[PDB]
mmCIF file of C-alpha atoms and ligand atoms in Angstrom:
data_model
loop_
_atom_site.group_PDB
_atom_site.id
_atom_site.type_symbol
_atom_site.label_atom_id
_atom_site.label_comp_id
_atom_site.label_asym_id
_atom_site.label_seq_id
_atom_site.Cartn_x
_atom_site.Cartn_y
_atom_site.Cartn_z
ATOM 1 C CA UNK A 1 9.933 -6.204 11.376
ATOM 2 C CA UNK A 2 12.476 -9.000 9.886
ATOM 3 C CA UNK A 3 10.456 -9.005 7.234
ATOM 4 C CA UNK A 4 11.050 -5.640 6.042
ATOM 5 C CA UNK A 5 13.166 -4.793 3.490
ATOM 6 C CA UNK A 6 16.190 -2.885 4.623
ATOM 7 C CA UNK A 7 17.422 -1.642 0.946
ATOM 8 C CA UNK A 8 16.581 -1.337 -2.169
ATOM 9 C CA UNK A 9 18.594 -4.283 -3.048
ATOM 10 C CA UNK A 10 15.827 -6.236 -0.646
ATOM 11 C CA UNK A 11 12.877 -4.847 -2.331
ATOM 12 C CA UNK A 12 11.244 -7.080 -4.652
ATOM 13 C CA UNK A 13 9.477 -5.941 -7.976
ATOM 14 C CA UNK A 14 8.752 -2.434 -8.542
ATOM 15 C CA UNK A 15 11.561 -1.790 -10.917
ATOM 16 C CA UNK A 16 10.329 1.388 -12.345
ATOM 17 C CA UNK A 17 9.984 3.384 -9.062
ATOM 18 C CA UNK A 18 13.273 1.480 -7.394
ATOM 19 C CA UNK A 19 15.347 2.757 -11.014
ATOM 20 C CA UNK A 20 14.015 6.270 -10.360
ATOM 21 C CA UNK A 21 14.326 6.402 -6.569
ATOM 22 C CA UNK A 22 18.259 4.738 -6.728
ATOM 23 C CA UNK A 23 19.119 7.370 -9.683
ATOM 24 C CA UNK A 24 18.239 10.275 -7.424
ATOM 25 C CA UNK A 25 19.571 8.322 -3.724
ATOM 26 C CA UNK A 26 23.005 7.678 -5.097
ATOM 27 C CA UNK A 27 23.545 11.042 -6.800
ATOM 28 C CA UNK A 28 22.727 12.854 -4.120
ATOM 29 C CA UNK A 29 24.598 10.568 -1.570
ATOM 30 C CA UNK A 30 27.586 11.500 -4.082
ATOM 31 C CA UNK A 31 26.966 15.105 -3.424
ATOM 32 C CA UNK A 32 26.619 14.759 -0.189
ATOM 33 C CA UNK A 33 22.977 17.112 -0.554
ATOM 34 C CA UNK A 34 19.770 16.736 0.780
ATOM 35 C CA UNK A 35 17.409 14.571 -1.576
ATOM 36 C CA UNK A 36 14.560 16.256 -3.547
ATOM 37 C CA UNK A 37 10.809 15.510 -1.888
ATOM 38 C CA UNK A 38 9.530 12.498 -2.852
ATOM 39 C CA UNK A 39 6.320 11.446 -2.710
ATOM 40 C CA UNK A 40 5.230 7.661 -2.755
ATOM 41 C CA UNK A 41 1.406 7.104 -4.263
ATOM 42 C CA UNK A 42 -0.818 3.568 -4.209
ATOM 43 C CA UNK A 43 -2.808 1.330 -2.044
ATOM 44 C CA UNK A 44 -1.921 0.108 0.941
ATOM 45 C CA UNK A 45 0.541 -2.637 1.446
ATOM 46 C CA UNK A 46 2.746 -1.778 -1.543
ATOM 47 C CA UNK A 47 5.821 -0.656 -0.194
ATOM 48 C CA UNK A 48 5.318 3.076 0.459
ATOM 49 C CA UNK A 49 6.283 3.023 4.398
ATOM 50 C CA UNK A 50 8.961 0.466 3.624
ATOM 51 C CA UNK A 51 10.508 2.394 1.034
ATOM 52 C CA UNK A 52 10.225 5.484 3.143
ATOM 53 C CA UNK A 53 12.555 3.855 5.780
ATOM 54 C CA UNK A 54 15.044 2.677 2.993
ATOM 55 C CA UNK A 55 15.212 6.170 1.702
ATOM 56 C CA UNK A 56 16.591 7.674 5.357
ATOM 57 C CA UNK A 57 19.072 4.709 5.618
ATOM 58 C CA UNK A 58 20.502 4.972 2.003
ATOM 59 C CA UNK A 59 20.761 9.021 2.989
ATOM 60 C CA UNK A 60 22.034 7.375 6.443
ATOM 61 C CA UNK A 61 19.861 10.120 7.983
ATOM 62 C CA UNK A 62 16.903 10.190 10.950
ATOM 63 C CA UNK A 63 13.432 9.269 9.735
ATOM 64 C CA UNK A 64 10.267 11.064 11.553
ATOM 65 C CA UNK A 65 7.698 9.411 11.175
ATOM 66 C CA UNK A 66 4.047 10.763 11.801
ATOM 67 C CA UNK A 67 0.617 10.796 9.867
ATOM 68 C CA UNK A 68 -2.316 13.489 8.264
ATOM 69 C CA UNK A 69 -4.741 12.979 11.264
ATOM 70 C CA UNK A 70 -2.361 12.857 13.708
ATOM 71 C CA UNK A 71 -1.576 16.027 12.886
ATOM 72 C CA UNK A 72 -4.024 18.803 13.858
ATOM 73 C CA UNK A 73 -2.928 21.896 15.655
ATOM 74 C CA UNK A 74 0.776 23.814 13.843
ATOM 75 C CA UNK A 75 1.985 23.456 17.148
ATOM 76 C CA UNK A 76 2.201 19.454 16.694
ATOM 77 C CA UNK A 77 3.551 20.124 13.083
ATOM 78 C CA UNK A 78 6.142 22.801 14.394
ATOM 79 C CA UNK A 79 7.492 20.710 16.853
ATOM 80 C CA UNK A 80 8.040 18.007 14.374
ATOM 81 C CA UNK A 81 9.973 20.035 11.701
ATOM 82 C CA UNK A 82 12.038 21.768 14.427
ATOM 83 C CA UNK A 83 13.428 18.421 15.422
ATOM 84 C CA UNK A 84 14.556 17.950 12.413
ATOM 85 C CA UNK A 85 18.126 17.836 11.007
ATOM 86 C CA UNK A 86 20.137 18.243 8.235
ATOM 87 C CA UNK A 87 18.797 16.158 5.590
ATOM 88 C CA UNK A 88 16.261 13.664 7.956
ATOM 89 C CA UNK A 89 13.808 12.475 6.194
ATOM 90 C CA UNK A 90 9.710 13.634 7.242
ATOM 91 C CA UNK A 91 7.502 11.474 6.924
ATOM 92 C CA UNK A 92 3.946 11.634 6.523
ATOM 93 C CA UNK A 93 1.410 8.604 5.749
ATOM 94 C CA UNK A 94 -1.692 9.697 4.629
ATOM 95 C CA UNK A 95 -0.140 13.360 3.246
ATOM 96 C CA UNK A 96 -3.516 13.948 1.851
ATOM 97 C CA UNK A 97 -5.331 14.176 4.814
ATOM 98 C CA UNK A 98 -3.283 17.255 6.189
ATOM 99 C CA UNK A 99 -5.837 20.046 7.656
ATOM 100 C CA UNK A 100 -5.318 23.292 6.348
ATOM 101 C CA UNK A 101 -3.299 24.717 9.363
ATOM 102 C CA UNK A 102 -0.425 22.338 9.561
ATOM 103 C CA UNK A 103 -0.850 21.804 5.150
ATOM 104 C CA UNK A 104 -0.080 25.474 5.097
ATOM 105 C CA UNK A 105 2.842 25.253 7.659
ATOM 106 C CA UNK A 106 4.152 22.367 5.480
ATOM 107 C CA UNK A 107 4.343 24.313 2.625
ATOM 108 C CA UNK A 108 5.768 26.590 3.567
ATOM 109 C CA UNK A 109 8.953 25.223 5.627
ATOM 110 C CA UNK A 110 9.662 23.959 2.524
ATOM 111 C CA UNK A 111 9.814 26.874 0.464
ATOM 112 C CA UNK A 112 13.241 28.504 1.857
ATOM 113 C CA UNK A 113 13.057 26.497 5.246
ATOM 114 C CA UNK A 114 11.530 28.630 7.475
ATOM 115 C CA UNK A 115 8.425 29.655 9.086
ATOM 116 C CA UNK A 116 6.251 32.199 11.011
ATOM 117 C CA UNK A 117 9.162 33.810 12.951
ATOM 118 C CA UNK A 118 14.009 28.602 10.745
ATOM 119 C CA UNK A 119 14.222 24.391 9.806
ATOM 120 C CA UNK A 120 17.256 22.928 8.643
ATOM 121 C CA UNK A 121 17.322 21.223 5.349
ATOM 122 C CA UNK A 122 14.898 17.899 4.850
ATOM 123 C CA UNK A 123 13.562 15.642 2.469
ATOM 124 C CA UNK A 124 9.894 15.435 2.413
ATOM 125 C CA UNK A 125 8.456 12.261 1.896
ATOM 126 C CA UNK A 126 4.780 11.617 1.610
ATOM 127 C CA UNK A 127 2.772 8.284 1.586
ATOM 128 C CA UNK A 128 -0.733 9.151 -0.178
ATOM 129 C CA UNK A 129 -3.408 6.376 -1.764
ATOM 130 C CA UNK A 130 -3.916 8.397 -4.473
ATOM 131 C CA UNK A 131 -1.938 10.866 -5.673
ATOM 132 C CA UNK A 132 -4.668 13.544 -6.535
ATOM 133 C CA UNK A 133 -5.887 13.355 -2.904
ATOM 134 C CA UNK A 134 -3.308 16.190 -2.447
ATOM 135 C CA UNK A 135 -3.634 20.081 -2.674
ATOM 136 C CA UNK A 136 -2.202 20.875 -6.072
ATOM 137 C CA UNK A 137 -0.004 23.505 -4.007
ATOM 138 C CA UNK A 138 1.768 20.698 -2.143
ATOM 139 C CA UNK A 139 1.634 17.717 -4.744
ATOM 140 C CA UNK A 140 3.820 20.704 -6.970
ATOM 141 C CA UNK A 141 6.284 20.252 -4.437
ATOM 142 C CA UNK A 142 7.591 17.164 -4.746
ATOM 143 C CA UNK A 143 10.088 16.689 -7.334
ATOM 144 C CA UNK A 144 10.061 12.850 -7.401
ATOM 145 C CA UNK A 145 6.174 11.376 -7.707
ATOM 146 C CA UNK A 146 6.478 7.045 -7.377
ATOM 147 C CA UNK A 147 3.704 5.508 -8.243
ATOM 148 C CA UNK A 148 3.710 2.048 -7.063
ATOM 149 C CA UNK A 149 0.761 -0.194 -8.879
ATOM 150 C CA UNK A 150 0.221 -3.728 -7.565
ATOM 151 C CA UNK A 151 3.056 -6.763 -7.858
ATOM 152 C CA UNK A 152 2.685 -9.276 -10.564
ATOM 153 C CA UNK A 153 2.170 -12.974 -9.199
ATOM 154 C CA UNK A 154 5.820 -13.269 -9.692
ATOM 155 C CA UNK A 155 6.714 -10.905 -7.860
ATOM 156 C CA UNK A 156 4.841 -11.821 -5.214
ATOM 157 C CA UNK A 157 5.755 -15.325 -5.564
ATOM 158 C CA UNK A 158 9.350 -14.383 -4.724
ATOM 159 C CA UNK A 159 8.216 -12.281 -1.769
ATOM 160 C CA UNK A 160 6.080 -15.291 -0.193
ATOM 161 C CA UNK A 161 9.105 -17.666 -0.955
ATOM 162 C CA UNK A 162 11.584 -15.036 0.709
ATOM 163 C CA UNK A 163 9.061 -14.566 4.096
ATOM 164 C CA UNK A 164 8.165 -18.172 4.431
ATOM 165 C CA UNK A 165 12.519 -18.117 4.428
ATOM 166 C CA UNK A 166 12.646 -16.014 7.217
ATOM 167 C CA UNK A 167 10.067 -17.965 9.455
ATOM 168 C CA UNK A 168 12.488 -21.084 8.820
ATOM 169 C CA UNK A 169 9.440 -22.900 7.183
ATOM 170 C CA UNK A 170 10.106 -24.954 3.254
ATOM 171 C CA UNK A 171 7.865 -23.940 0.656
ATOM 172 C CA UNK A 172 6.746 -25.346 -2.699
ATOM 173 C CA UNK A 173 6.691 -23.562 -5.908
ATOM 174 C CA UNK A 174 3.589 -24.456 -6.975
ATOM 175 C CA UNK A 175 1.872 -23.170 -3.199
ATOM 176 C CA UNK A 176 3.923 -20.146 -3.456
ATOM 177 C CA UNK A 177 2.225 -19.323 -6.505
ATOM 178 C CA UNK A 178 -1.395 -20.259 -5.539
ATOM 179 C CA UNK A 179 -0.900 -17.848 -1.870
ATOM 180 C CA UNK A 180 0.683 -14.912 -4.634
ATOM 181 C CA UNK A 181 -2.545 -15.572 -6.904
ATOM 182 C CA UNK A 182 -4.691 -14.766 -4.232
ATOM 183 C CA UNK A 183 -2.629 -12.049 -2.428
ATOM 184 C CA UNK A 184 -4.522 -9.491 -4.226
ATOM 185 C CA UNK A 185 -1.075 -7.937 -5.820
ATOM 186 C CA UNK A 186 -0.146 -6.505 -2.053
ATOM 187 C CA UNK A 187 2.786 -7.594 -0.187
ATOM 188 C CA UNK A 188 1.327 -6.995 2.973
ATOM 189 C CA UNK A 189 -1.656 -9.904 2.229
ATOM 190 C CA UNK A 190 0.664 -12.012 0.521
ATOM 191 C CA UNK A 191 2.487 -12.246 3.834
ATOM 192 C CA UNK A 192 0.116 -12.402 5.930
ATOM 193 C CA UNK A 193 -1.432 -15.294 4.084
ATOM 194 C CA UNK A 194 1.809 -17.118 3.915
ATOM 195 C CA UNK A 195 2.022 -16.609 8.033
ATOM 196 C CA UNK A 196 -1.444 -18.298 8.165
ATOM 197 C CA UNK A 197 -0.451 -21.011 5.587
ATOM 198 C CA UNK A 198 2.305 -21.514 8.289
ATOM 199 C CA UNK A 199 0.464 -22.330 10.936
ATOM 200 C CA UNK A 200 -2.051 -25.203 8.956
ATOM 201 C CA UNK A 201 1.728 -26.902 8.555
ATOM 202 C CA UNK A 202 2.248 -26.272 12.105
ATOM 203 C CA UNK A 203 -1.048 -27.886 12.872
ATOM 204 C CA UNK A 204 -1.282 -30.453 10.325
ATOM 205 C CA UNK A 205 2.492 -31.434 11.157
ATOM 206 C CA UNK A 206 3.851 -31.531 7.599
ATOM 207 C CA UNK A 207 7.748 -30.800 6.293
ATOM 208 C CA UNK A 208 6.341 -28.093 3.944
ATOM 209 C CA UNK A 209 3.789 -26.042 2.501
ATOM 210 C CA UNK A 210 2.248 -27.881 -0.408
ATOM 211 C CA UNK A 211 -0.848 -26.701 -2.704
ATOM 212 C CA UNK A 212 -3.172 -28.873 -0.419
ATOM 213 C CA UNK A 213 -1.865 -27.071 2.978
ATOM 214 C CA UNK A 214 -2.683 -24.013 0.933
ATOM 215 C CA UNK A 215 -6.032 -24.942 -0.115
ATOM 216 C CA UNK A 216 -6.981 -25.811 3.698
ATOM 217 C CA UNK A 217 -5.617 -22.815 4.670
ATOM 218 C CA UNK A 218 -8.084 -20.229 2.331
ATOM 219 C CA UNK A 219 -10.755 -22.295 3.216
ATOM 220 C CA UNK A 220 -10.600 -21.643 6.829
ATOM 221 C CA UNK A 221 -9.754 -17.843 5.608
ATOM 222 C CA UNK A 222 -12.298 -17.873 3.537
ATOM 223 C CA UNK A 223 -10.074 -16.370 0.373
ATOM 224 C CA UNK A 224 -11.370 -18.001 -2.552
ATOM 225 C CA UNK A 225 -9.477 -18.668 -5.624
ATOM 226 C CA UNK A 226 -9.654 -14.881 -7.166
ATOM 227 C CA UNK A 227 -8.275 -14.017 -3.785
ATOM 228 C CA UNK A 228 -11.132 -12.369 -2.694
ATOM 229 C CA UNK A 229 -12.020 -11.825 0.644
ATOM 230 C CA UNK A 230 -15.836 -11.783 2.512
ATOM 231 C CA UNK A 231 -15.545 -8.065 2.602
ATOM 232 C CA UNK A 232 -14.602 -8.653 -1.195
ATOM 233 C CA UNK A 233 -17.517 -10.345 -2.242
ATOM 234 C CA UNK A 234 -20.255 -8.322 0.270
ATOM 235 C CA UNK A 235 -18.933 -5.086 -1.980
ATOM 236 C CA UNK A 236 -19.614 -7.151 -5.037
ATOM 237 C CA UNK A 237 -23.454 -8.248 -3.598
ATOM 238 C CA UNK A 238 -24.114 -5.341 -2.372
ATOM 239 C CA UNK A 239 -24.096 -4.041 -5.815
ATOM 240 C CA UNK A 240 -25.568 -7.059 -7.079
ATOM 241 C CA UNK A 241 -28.756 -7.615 -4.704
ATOM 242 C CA UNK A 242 -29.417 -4.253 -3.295
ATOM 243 C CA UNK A 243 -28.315 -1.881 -6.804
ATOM 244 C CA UNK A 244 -29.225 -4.439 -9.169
ATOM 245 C CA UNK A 245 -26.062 -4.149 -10.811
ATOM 246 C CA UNK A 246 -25.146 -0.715 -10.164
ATOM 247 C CA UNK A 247 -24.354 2.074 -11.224
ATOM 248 C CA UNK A 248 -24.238 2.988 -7.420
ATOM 249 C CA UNK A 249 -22.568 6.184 -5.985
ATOM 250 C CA UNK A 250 -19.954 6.229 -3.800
ATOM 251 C CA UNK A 251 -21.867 7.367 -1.080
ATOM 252 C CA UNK A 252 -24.759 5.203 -1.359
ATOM 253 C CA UNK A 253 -22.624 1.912 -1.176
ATOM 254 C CA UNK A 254 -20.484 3.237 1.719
ATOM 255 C CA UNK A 255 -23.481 3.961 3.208
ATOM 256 C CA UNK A 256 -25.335 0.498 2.998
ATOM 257 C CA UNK A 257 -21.962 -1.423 3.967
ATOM 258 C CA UNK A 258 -21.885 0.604 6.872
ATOM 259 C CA UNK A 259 -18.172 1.982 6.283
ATOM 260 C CA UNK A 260 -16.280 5.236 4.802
ATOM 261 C CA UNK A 261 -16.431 6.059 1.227
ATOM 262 C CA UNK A 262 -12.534 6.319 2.120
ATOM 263 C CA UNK A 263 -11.609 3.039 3.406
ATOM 264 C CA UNK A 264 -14.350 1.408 0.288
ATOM 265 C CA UNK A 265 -12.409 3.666 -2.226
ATOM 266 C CA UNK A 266 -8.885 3.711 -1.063
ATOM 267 C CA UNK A 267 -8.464 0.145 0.253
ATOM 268 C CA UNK A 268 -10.657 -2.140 -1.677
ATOM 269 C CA UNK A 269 -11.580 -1.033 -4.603
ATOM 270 C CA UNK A 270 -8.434 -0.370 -6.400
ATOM 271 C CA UNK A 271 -7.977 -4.609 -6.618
ATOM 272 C CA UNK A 272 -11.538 -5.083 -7.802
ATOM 273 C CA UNK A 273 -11.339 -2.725 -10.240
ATOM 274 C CA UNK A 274 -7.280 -4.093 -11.878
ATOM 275 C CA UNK A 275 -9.334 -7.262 -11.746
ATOM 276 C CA UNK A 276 -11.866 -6.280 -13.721
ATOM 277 C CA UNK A 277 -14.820 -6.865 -11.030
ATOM 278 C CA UNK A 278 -15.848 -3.008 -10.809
ATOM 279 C CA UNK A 279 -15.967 -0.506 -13.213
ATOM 280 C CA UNK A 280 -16.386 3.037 -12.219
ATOM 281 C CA UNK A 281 -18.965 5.265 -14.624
ATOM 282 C CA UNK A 282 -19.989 8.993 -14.183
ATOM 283 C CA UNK A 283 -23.369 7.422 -12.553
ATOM 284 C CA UNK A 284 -21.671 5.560 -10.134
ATOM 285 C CA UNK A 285 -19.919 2.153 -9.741
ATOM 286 C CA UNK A 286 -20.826 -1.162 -11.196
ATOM 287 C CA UNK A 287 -20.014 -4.734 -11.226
ATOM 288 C CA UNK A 288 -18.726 -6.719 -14.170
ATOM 289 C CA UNK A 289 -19.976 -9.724 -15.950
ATOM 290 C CA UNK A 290 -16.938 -11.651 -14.338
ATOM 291 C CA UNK A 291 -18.229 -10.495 -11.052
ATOM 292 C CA UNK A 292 -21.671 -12.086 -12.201
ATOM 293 C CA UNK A 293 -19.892 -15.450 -12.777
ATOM 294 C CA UNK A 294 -17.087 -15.484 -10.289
ATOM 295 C CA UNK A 295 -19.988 -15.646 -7.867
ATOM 296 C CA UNK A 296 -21.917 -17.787 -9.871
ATOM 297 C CA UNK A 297 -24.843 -15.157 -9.792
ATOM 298 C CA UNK A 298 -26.819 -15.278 -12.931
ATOM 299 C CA UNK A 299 -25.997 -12.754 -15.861
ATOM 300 C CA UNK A 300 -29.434 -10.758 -15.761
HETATM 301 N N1 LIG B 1 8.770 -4.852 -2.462
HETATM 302 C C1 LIG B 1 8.594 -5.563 -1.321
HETATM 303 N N2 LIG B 1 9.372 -6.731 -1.082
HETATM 304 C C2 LIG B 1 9.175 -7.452 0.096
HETATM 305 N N3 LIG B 1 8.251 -7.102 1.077
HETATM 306 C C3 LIG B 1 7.498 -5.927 0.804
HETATM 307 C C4 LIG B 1 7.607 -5.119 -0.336
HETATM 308 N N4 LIG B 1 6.733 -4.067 -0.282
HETATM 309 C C5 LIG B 1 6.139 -4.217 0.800
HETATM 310 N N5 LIG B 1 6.523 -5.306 1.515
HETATM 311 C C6 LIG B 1 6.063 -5.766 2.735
HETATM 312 O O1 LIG B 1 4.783 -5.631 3.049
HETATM 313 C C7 LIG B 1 4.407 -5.059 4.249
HETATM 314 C C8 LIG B 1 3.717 -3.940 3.855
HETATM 315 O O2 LIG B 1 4.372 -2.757 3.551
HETATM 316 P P1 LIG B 1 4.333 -1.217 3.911
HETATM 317 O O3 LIG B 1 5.564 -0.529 3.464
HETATM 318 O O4 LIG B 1 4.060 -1.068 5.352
HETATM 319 O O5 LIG B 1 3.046 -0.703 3.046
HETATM 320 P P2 LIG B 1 2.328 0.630 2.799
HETATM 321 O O6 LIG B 1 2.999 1.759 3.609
HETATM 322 O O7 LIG B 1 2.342 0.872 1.345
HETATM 323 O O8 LIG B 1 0.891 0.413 3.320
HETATM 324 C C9 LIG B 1 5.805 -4.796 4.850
HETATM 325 O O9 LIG B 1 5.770 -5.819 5.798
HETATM 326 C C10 LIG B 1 6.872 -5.157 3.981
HETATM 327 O O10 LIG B 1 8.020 -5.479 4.799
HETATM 328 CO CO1 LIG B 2 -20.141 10.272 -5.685
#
């Protein structure tokens, strides 16, 4: 909520994606026209809802705001565009996970704005994990593609030291940089670790968060110094113990940690593999020497 950036101006780090989103939000503010589709690719907690909203108040425009599964019979996705007006912004988290009926609705209201038996002018904006997830009939359709990669430790350094700001609570530099180490490169952990980091000063009644408030706090998290979570390091021994090492298929592992191949491949593994702890082969995926000695499991 108050934690949200409100403009560009407020969001931290991605410079690449907020140079190419500003370039195409001022011009057409300066034309007064309705922006291009964009559509807003990477893992979760990046940015993609919050930059979503900042897109509709820049255009100073409604946002609607719905999602894939949500979605399932055209009526649900007719209602929805018909509510919209000149140049709102639509938008859909989890694009990729449109069913065919409303997908082919979707498309196309946005080829001249009309459908079965007309929509006034929007901006599309969809929130995806990965980009390929989508049909390549609608992923042609958006003229601007941001794809946001995780935050360096800097960047996320700033962002804890801005939140821990906004919850009126001092913060060191040094324990703002051990919470960003471990925040996985997502805002959204990064805060919520620095809310949890809170309350240990709360408890522990000290004037501000130091590296040994920190510490105390990831221990009773159980976060260890890579950042990595229990569901973390079960992926990683799961591979380990049960597929010696991998390579493992997709399937197989979701199947043994008793989740999705979705949520395994969309939410956690991205981090483990820009860490270098998974590597993904033909044959399946596998775990990396560092994996090996991060969890001090002998290198077979
Ligand atoms: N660049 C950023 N600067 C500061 N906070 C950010 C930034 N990107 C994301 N966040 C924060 O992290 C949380 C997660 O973001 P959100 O936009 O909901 O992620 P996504 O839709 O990609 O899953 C939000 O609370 C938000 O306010
Ligand atoms: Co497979």
């Amino acid at each position: 909520q108050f934690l949200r950036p409100k403009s560009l101006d407020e969001f931290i780090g991605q410079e690449n994606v907020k140079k190419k989103l500003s370039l195409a939000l001022e011009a057409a503010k300066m034309r007064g026209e309705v922006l291009d589709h964009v559509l807003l690719a990477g893992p979760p907690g990046l940015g993609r809802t919050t930059l979503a909203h900042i897109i509709a108040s820049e255009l100073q425009t409604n946002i609607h705001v719905t999602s894939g599964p949500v979605l399932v019979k055209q009526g649900d996705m007719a209602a929805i565009l018909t509510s919209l007006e000149r140049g709102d912004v639509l938008f859909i988290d989890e694009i990729h996970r449109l069913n065919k009926a409303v997908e082919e609705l979707l498309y196309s209201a946005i080829e001249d704005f009309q459908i079965d038996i007309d929509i006034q002018p929007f901006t599309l904006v969809g929130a995806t994990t990965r980009s390929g997830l989508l049909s390549s009939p609608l992923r042609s359709r958006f003229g601007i593609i941001l794809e946001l990669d995780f935050y360096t430790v800097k960047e996320l350094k700033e962002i804890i030291k801005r939140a821990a700001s906004l919850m009126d609570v001092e913060i060191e530099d040094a324990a703002a940089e051990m919470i960003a180490k471990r925040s996985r490169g997502t805002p959204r952990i990064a805060i919520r670790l620095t809310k949890r980091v809170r309350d240990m000063l709360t408890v522990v009644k000290a004037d501000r968060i130091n590296t040994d408030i920190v510490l105390k706090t990831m221990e009773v998290l159980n976060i260890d110094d890579e950042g990595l979570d229990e569901f973390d390091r079960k992926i990683l021994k799961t591979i380990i113990e049960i597929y010696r090492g991998g390579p493992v298929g997709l399937n197989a592992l979701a199947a043994s940690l008793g989740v999705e191949a979705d949520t395994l491949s969309e939410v956690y593994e991205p981090y483990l593999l820009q860490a270098g702890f998974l590597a993904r082969t033909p044959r399946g995926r596998i775990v990396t020497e560092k994996a090996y000695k991060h969890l001090k499991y002998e290198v077979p």
